[PDB]
Design a protein around this ligand. Structure first.
Ligand SMILES: *[C@@H]1O[C@H](CO[C@@H]2O[C@@H](C)[C@@H](O)[C@@H](O)[C@@H]2O)[C@@H](O[C@@H]2O[C@H](CO)[C@@H](O)[C@H](O)[C@H]2NC(C)=O)[C@H](O)[C@H]1NC(C)=O
Ligand SMILES: *[C@@H]1O[C@H](CO)[C@@H](O[C@@H]2O[C@H](CO)[C@@H](O)[C@H](O)[C@H]2NC(C)=O)[C@H](O)[C@H]1NC(C)=O
Ligand SMILES: *[C@@H]1O[C@H](CO)[C@@H](O[C@@H]2O[C@H](CO)[C@@H](O)[C@H](O)[C@H]2NC(C)=O)[C@H](O)[C@H]1NC(C)=O
Ligand SMILES: *[C@@H]1O[C@H](CO)[C@@H](O[C@@H]2O[C@H](CO)[C@@H](O)[C@H](O)[C@H]2NC(C)=O)[C@H](O)[C@H]1NC(C)=O
Ligand SMILES: *[C@@H]1O[C@H](CO)[C@@H](O[C@@H]2O[C@H](CO)[C@@H](O)[C@H](O)[C@H]2NC(C)=O)[C@H](O)[C@H]1NC(C)=O
Ligand SMILES: *[C@@H]1O[C@H](CO)[C@@H](O[C@@H]2O[C@H](CO)[C@@H](O)[C@H](O)[C@H]2NC(C)=O)[C@H](O)[C@H]1NC(C)=O
Ligand SMILES: *[C@@H]1O[C@H](CO)[C@@H](O)[C@H](O)[C@H]1NC(C)=O
Ligand SMILES: *[C@@H]1O[C@H](CO)[C@@H](O)[C@H](O)[C@H]1NC(C)=O
Ligand SMILES: *[C@@H]1O[C@H](CO)[C@@H](O)[C@H](O)[C@H]1NC(C)=O
Ligand SMILES: *[C@@H]1O[C@H](CO)[C@@H](O)[C@H](O)[C@H]1NC(C)=O
Ligand SMILES: *[C@@H]1O[C@H](CO)[C@@H](O)[C@H](O)[C@H]1NC(C)=O
Ligand SMILES: *[C@@H]1O[C@H](CO)[C@@H](O)[C@H](O)[C@H]1NC(C)=O
Ligand SMILES: *[C@@H]1O[C@H](CO)[C@@H](O)[C@H](O)[C@H]1NC(C)=O
Lengths: 10, 650
């Protein structure tokens, strides 16, 4: 089970 | 085979808390007719098990008795989403045929053994969401056929091994949410097939390697929330397949590289919360695909370049909390797709541009504590998509009824400390979902439209420090969600309406510095959230009503500078949260009630310039009060060994 990470908006 | 099956049964016999609804009910007959056709999770080739897939089967146990020496043909192993504890044995590296290896989402602990590097056929390694610790062994770099490594959300420490440069088939590398440290090895930049590189939420230090310019296939580079330092290398502009570059929350210094304009695919750029300085390069305007540009919370100086008008796909522009200055060019707001323009906490000057909201889609425009001025552009007047408008601290001007149009989805607007004049329009009523309407300290005149009180979603209404006139109507009770009501510092006249008694969500009420006349409504006794009530500096008269003593949450009550007379109710004792009480500059008579001794929370009290007489009650606020808290009264008297400017009592 694997997802890339997600950068959140400021 | 019978031998493989019996070994797996022995491992199964060690599982705990198994509930016999288990899918492993099917593990009974070790003969091939059963083992290779009916055992849950088993698949065979030529009578031998090659796939074991027990993902999410509620198994609780360890791999202590996993049959390493009995499953030579294991090729795919997925034991994810179970309750496996203990460590990862070196013996996992003896499965010479293994291509797919997933132990993710378990409660595994301890270090990754170097023997996993013996799995020369491994294509996928997944060990995510465990509590694995120690360093990643260098021998993992021997997995020359691996295309995906995911070890995110563990307790790993130490550096990323430089042997990872030997993983020439690696496509996705996911190591986020660990405590990896040291510098990123420059050998990572020489991985030709790499597409996604996620190293975010670690403790990496040192500079981004200039070899990253060789990463021509990387579309995702996430390294936010690390301790990376130095300057972003100009070679990053050679990452010409990047879609998303996130370096936010690091310690990067120096200028933004102008070569970022070379990345024509770049749609998302997060550089916020660094120490980037210098001017925004005009070449950033050449990032033709840019949608979401966030460089807030840095130390950037100088002007926004006109070339931002070339960013025709721009939707979010975050520039707040920098030291940018000067006028903003019309290109900054030229995107028809722009929905969020965030410029707060900079030193911008001049007018807003007439390009603003030309696409009809702008939602959030925040400009706080700049030096903008001039009239509101008519395109913003007509911008029906607005949701959040924050202008506080600028010097915009013009007639407020001409400046702003109708905003059906407006949620929040703050125009504090600007220079608008004119009378409020009934058009604001069309913002039926508005929750905050903040217009403090403009030059607004005229009456409050009666339609304002039909804005029933309002929670904060602040018209303070204007020159608004007229009387407040009883229909003020219609704003029944209001929690903060600030009408202070205006010219409101007439009596305070009894309808305020129905505003039971009120926490903070300021009607001070107006021309309110006649009596405080005696029905203000049921505002159970009210902690602040300021009616000072009005012409209120007659007695202070006992209903106020039922406002149990009051912390500050200021009725000073009025014409109130009669006696101070001894029922003030009931205000057990009251910290500050100001009744000065009134016409109050009689004695200060001895019941004030009950008010242990009181810390500040002022009863000066009244017609009061008699001794001072015994509580800390009265004992600590300075002489001017009592001056100007008729016959007050004090006690010896506490100077407050009073003749001692007899
Ligand atoms: C890596 O982990 C082992 C195990 O640590 C313990 O087990 C974890 C599941 C968790 O309970 C931790 O809080 C424990 O420390 C470490 O080896 C232990 O090190 C401590 C040193 O404080 C020592 O007292 C223990 O006896 C060791 N062994 C065990 C079984 O606890 C190891 O030091 C960790 N860190 C590495 C390898 O860098
Ligand atoms: C992006 O990559 C190109 C390679 O195609 C870089 O050009 C290199 O640098 C020298 C001098 O700038 C050029 O003359 C050569 O074409 C290239 N040489 C080598 C050894 O690669 C270009 O400089 C790179 N851009 C950045 C910002 O680093
Ligand atoms: C606003 O953006 C438009 C494009 O959406 C810009 O108009 C283009 O300008 C270039 C000039 O380099 C022309 O080649 C294109 O034909 C223009 N397109 C259209 C539709 O007119 C415009 O320059 C921008 N305005 C600014 C930045 O003030
Ligand atoms: C330009 O930038 C900011 C905002 O426009 C100003 O910084 C703040 O000023 C207030 C008023 O003195 C202080 O209370 C803050 O602590 C300041 N710093 C912040 C918010 O980070 C700043 O004064 C302006 N600088 C120049 C040179 O004009
Ligand atoms: C503009 O600002 C508002 C914040 O008021 C954003 O709307 C909120 O978005 C969050 C996240 O989805 C929701 O939970 C809230 O319900 C929204 N509030 C309202 C009042 O709509 C909005 O997303 C922003 N616009 C953007 C980012 O394009
Ligand atoms: C209630 O509101 C008044 C303003 O209507 C506040 O008045 C100030 O009080 C201090 C000390 O009494 C003075 O130095 C100021 O000049 C007063 N006037 C103004 C216009 O600020 C008063 O502080 C408020 N009471 C509380 C408890 O917050
Ligand atoms: C299974 O392993 C045995 C022992 O190594 C081997 O002889 C046999 O060929 C293997 N079968 C398959 C299908 O891989
Ligand atoms: C294991 O089974 C799940 C559920 O069908 C599947 O999605 C997953 O890809 C399988 N993994 C392997 C290695 O067969
Ligand atoms: C990558 O390759 C070398 C030789 O091909 C190998 O010995 C080692 O695993 C790696 N080299 C370094 C310097 O890490
Ligand atoms: C990117 O494309 C493929 C793999 O995605 C391969 O040719 C190589 O890794 C890359 N091509 C380059 C760097 O020219
Ligand atoms: C890295 O260390 C900092 C303190 O230096 C800490 O606040 C941060 O959360 C750490 N990050 C990780 C992923 O452990
Ligand atoms: C940016 O930072 C570097 C290092 O402190 C410094 O040399 C450079 O002059 C700075 N630029 C500005 C405009 O402050
Ligand atoms: C309110 O406005 C006046 C004049 O417009 C200004 O001098 C004062 O600083 C403003 N108050 C605040 C808190 O900005």
């Amino acid at each position: 089970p694997v997802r890339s990470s997600q950068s959140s908006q400021a | 085979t019978v031998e493989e099956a019996n070994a797996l049964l022995k491992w199964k016999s060690t599982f705990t808390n198994q509930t016999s609804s288990s899918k492993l009910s099917s593990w009974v007959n070790p003969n091939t007719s059963s083992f290779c056709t009916s055992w849950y999770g088993v698949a065979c080739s030529l009578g031998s098990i090659i796939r074991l897939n027990l993902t999410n089967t509620g198994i609780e146990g360890t791999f202590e008795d996993f049959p390493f020496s009995s499953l030579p043909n294991l090729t795919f192993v997925d034991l994810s989403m179970n309750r496996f504890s203990g460590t990862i044995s070196p013996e996992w590296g003896r499965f010479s045929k293994l291509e797919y290896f997933d132990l993710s989402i378990n409660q595994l602990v301890g270090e990754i053994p170097p023997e996993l590097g013996k799995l020369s056929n491994l294509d996928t390694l997944h060990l995510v969401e465990n509590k694995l610790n120690g360093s990643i062994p260098s021998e993992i770099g021997r997995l020359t056929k691996v295309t995906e490594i995911a070890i995110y959300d563990n307790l790993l420490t130490g550096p990323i091994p430089s042997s990872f440069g030997n993983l020439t088939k690696l496509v996705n590398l996911y190591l986020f949410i660990n405590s990896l440290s040291g510098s990123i090895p420059s050998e990572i930049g020489n991985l030709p097939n790499l597409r996604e590189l996620c190293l975010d939420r670690n403790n990496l230090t040192g500079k981004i390697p200039s070899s990253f310019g060789n990463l021509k296939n990387v579309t995702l580079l996430n390294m936010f929330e690390n301790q990376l330092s130095g300057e972003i290398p100009p070679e990053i502009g050679n990452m010409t397949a990047l879609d998303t570059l996130s370096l936010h929350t690091n310690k990067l210094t120096g200028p933004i590289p102008s070569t970022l304009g070379n990345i024509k695919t770049l749609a998302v750029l997060h550089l916020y919360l660094n120490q980037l300085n210098g001017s925004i390069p005009p070449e950033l305007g050449e990032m033709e695909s840019m949608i979401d540009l966030e460089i807030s919370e840095n130390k950037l100086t100088g002007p926004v370049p006109d070339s931002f008008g070339k960013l025709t796909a721009l939707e979010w522009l975050f520039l707040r909390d920098n030291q940018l200055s000067g006028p903003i060019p019309p290109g900054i707001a030229n995107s028809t797709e722009l929905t969020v323009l965030q410029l707060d906490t900079n030193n911008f000057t001049g007018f807003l541009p007439d390009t603003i909201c030309r696409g009809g889609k702008l939602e959030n425009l925040t400009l706080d504590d700049n030096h903008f001025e001039g009239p509101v552009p008519k395109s913003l007047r007509d911008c029906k998509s607005l949701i959040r408008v924050r202008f506080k601290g600028n010097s915009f001007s013009g007639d407020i009824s001409e400046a702003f149009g109708v905003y059906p989805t407006l949620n929040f607007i703050d125009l504090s400390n600007n220079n608008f004049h004119g009378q409020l329009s009934a058009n604001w009523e069309q913002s039926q979902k508005l929750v905050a309407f903040i217009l403090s300290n403009n030059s607004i005149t005229g009456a409050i439209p009666p339609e304002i009180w039909n804005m029933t979603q309002l929670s904060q209404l602040d018209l303070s420090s204007n020159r608004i006139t007229g009387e407040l109507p009883e229909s003020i009770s219609n704003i029944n969600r209001i929690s903060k009501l600030q009408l202070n510092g205006n010219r409101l006249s007439g009596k305070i309406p009894s309808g305020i008694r129905l505003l039971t969500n009120l926490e903070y009420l300021d009607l001070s510095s107006n021309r309110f006349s006649f009596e405080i409504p005696p029905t203000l006794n049921n505002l159970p959230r009210l902690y602040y009530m300021n009616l000072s500096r009005n012409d209120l008269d007659q007695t202070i009503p006992e209903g106020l003593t039922k406002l149990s949450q009051l912390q500050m009550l200021d009725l000073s500078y009025n014409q109130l007379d009669g006696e101070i109710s001894s029922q003030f004792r009931s205000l057990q949260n009251l910290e500050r009480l100001d009744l000065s500059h009134n016409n109050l008579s009689g004695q200060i009630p001895p019941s004030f001794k009950d008010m242990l929370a009181l810390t500040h009290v002022d009863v000066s310039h009244n017609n009061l007489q008699g001794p001072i009650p015994d509580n800390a606020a009265f004992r600590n009060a300075p002489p001017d808290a009592f001056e100007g009264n008729k016959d007050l008297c004090g006690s010896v060994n506490t100077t407050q400017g009073l003749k001692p009592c007899s």
